[PDB]
Write an enzyme that holds these catalytic residues in place. Sequence first.
Site, PDB file in Angstrom:
ATOM      1  N   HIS A  60       2.136   6.837   0.544  1.00 29.57           N
ATOM      2  CA  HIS A  60       1.336   6.025   1.377  1.00 29.57           C
ATOM      3  C   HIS A  60      -0.068   6.189   1.025  1.00 29.57           C
ATOM      4  CE1 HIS A  60      -0.807   4.500   4.979  1.00 29.57           C
ATOM      5  NE2 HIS A  60       0.256   3.657   5.078  1.00 29.57           N
ATOM      6  N   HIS A 104       0.842  -1.175   0.000  1.00 30.30           N
ATOM      7  CA  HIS A 104       0.000   0.000   0.000  1.00 30.30           C
ATOM      8  C   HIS A 104       0.874   1.220   0.000  1.00 30.30           C
ATOM      9  CE1 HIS A 104      -0.207  -0.079   4.757  1.00 30.30           C
ATOM     10  NE2 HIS A 104       0.663   0.848   4.413  1.00 30.30           N
TER      11      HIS A 104
HETATM   12 ZN    ZN Z   1      -0.316   1.947   6.361  1.00 33.95          ZN
END
Ligand code: ZN
Lengths: 489, 489, 161, 161
Positions: free
Chosen positions: C83, C68
């Site tokens: 992020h 992610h």
């Molecule tokens: Zn995270």
Amino acid sequence: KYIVALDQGTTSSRAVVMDHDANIISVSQREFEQIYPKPGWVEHDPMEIWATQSSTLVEVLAKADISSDQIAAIGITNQRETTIVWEKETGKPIYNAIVWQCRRTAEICEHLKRDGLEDYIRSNTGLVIDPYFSGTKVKWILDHVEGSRERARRGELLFGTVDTWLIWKMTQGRVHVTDYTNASRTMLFNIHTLDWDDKMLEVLDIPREMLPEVRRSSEVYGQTNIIPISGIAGDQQAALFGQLCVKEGMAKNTYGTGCFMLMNTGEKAVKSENGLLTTIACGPTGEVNYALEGAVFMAGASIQWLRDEMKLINDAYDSEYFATKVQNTNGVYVVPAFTGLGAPYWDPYARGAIFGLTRGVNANHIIRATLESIAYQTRDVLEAMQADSGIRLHALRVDGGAVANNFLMQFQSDILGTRVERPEVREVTALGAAYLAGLAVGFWQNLDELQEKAVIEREFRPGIETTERNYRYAGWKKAVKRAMAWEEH
Amino acid sequence: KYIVALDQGTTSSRAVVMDHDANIISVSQREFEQIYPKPGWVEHDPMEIWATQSSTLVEVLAKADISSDQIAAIGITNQRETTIVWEKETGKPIYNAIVWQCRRTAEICEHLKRDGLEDYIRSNTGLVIDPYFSGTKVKWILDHVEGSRERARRGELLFGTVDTWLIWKMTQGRVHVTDYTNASRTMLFNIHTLDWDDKMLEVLDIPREMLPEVRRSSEVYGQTNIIPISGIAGDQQAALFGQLCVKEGMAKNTYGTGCFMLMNTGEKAVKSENGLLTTIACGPTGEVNYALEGAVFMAGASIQWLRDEMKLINDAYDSEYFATKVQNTNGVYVVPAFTGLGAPYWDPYARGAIFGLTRGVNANHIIRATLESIAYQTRDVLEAMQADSGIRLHALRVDGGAVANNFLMQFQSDILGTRVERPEVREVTALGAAYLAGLAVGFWQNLDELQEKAVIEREFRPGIETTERNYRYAGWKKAVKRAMAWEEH
Amino acid sequence: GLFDKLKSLVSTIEIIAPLSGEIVNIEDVPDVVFAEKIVGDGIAIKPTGNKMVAPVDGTIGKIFETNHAFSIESDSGVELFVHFGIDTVELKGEGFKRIAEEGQRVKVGDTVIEFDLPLLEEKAKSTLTPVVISNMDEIKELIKLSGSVTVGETPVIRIKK
Amino acid sequence: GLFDKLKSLVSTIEIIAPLSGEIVNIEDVPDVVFAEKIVGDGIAIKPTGNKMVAPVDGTIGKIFETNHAFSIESDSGVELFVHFGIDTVELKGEGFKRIAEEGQRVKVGDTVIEFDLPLLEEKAKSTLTPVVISNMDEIKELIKLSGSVTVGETPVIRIKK
Ligand SMILES: [Zn+2]
Ligand SMILES: Nc1ncnc2c1ncn2[C@@H]1O[C@H](COP(=O)(O)OP(=O)(O)O)[C@@H](O)[C@H]1O
Ligand SMILES: Nc1ncnc2c1ncn2[C@@H]1O[C@H](COP(=O)(O)OP(=O)(O)O)[C@@H](O)[C@H]1O
Ligand SMILES: O=C[C@@H](O)COP(=O)(O)O
Ligand SMILES: O=C[C@@H](O)COP(=O)(O)O
Ligand SMILES: [Mg+2]
Ligand SMILES: [Mg+2]
Ligand SMILES: [Zn+2]
């Protein structure tokens, strides 16, 4: 002249050779890698079981000095549920073997439960919705490959269990069969109609095309070149058989990688109302019998954990010694749900936990508790069997690798308040298959020819500590309940 | 010329020697036995602290080459709450020292709670009903000796904390005093009226006769022959002091056997509504100040556990290395409530537990999780402090033996999402007492003389992993909740 | 159906949109480490669809296991950190596909991870996607662009090192 | 108040009452290991008060940590096991006092453990106190007496070895 048996287990692959007098002549064992690609996932490499199993054969025959000329038959026992898919042309797997322990298809089970199949699945399979069995493992595989189903309807793809798999690899692709024991484990086979369940196959999107041929546990399936393979049975059943399970109300407990407690119910399929499985066994000629099974995923494997990952011990055998340097676990409890809880719990979400620790608890407390979970788990199952079956065991017959542990055996006795009889030859799982195979080849003719190799090496009887057994067990219960449902979804 | 400080901790007994320029000249440390007569009980042998502490002194002075002639004063720091009773004639204990950690008087606390004292005890002591503090330990002692109370009304029996105890043994029975910090810890002293609580003393059946003299944390208590002892303070407070705690809203975290987080509230006794203690500290002249404390029983001690009982490591220092061979704990969590849970939990029934275990989890996963509990616990406390105090720390100042662990420090930073400043001299607890003592002897005159020895050796700042911090912490929370209330009553 | 194969139009430090959508104030990311620029400074991005890509030529540092987020170090000596969303790690890698590997050199535009904006849309706590420079200390000036951006195309920031 | 000090009246294998009260059928002890004589055979005793004592001269084997029970081996080669009550181990040693030590030789009548019949009376699940021979195998005959018995005095069983 002799029979040769092949036991291909969770942990390792073996090869035993007995004589007509059913005497263990020579053995070959070879451990193999467990793969944990992630969380509560387990996997083995098909090529390695294969490799491992093959090799073991050779080296046994060689060991003893024997040839294709003196071996009456080949008896085959194996780890259950563990699913394999493989391209038919090639003889190559399309994925790694998924283990009975492995918890990946937990979501899938959640659908099944969401849908309403419990009732159905129980009734026809005798099984319980759990990632433990074959069904969901297959789906997940075809679901996690591009050209899967399709390639498989056209049947370029075979399904199979370690028996089917090991067989096909020896009948050089000729023979694609499973036995009756093995198939029950799948969640796709019907135990009353004795054949593949149409509904399961649908619901799970599986293709009859991949399903092998289901047959008797004693029959000549074929011939291979080291000659005919004539026996087949899931390891637990083979052990029940080599124990001379065989008649109603007869029961054994196997202490290996896991613990499996089975009781013959003859020709009646008893419906468990206490977290046990209804499954198939053998009758004295290798015929279909029914049975009650209580499965516990972690037993001996905890010891391997101490030995290999925690590194608290060099050999598993060393556990008796350290465990007994202690008198008590000082309050500690070990819930070994490393791969969920099996019977009668069936919670694939539980994970392993240690409990009741204070500053004076040390390694021996820990090892010994580990050992104790073994007894406790057994006991949970046993109680279930008793309730389901209305019968009260007066002795527990056992076998398995862990049964060489006098501490655990005794502890087992105290904990249950029941005698424990430890058979003279521990390698009973093998024995089972041999018979099944020899019998089928006129190697023996009668089971009775053998109500004699089954000598009892030891009886363990309840010591005075047995009075304490219910307090201790309550701990256990408390504990268990807290390892429960760790993982999420 | 120099001051000499004596730090007598949970784990060991030390002796530091600084110069006028407050430079650590020489140190002597000596570990000592922890006794666990049972369950969550802890005990030390008075004669051994004594022995251990004495000896340490000598050997420091000898080490550096110094005499009774060049040592300006003696500063004394010690482990809190740990209760001692002793015959006045003899100079002999009537029982082993009962440790702050020890959970024996848990029932007694249950009475107190049953009775209605919570509200009272909080309000006057700033404390919480828990076996952690002195009160109940004393009662239990007089209650577990025939000629106790009686012998004590007639005052042949003295009570005391390691400061009182260590003192008396050096003022050869002359001086029987405790400081203000130490006394607060007792559950018998009133923090507003600054004296022994009449109600407590009753309710707990204790005899004013055994209570020592309560005095300033900087004062010459007396003189001893290796000369005057002029400083006294509970270890946590001494550290807050040597950190230069001193002014409102100033906070430190100590990582030792346990973890103690303290914040100066100057002259206001703040009422915690989030599981923290209200207690006493020092103001820049060693005067009474109030403070907020969050205590966590197990920190560095977990490491000692791995090192001494589990035997997974040779040195505690080795834990950084193994912990970092891993990247993650693979899902494992360690709740180190070996001796209950302290703040903000205060559950003397909780016991240590390990969680989220699967077959591929190994020793490094375990060590590192241990290390992590340290951060997590800190964090639980910190949050509480922030809520109680309305202030948001922007950096955390720290000290203690564990702070030499870059892994843990960094992990601490990520986990909180806050900077962590690691002071140049870790031995701050000592430092604290020295000042208190030197100050009192005109050795220094001013605290300002020292807004310079407090160099910052390192700053730890949040890495990218900090984004993950709340997921991880949730684990922790889940975990904790399950170690809770293990023991019964 | 995908012009992935096809040739595309091809046009101080400039950092390129590693993912697409509307630019946002770091200050509005619902997570303090971000908002207070504790981890670093940069911008955020509400998102377009389909994928995350290199924002500079450099080498890919860490690729979070649950894929992610990742970081990377520019040949220029800058550190970026991307992020996706907030608390996404709880989806346990569900919506993410690792196209790149924790160690290769990339150019702007090289695919790095792939995603399912919609699964992520209703599962995620938030979809904001912070883009920050972690090594603030080593950079003199940092300029924040605005509005709409397109992957591998529009620049989000300029910085003087 | 205690004639502990004072001299008392002093009168095949005979086992002596190790504790006092009415004799009962092992068969009626509410615990199978007992009732079915799994641990061994013997009798049970509803109890008098105050204490448990050696039932034969021999050596004291185990003394359960929670001091509610113990065993002993007679000079004659018999094994006895005295277990106070049922599940008592849960009181965690509350009502019990270890007068003897896991290893000494005793004579009939020597005190072994002491107890609080009343605390035990309402706390315990049951107060029955089984007295069994664990080494059944090594004994030919085993005779069970009846009715009332007094510590160190009345015999509960006779046995032929
Ligand atoms: Zn995270
Ligand atoms: N002395 C022992 N005590 C406990 N476990 C033992 C002992 N000796 C061997 N083992 C354990 O027994 C198991 C091996 O049993 P086996 O019946 O060969 O199991 P499997 O069929 O699953 O391979 C292992 O899990 C192992 O670590
Ligand atoms: N590198 C390290 N990492 C973790 N713990 C450490 C390390 N070095 C020492 N220790 C630990 O730090 C503690 C010692 O800290 P100290 O402040 O001296 O505590 P105390 O005052 O309670 O005696 C121990 O519990 C110990 O095992
Ligand atoms: O249910 C699976 C069992 O077959 C496992 O058998 P095992 O312990 O011998 O590997
Ligand atoms: O609350 C007790 C504290 O004083 C313990 O201090 P310590 O970790 O240095 O032994
Ligand atoms: Mg086997
Ligand atoms: Mg200290
Ligand atoms: Zn008992």
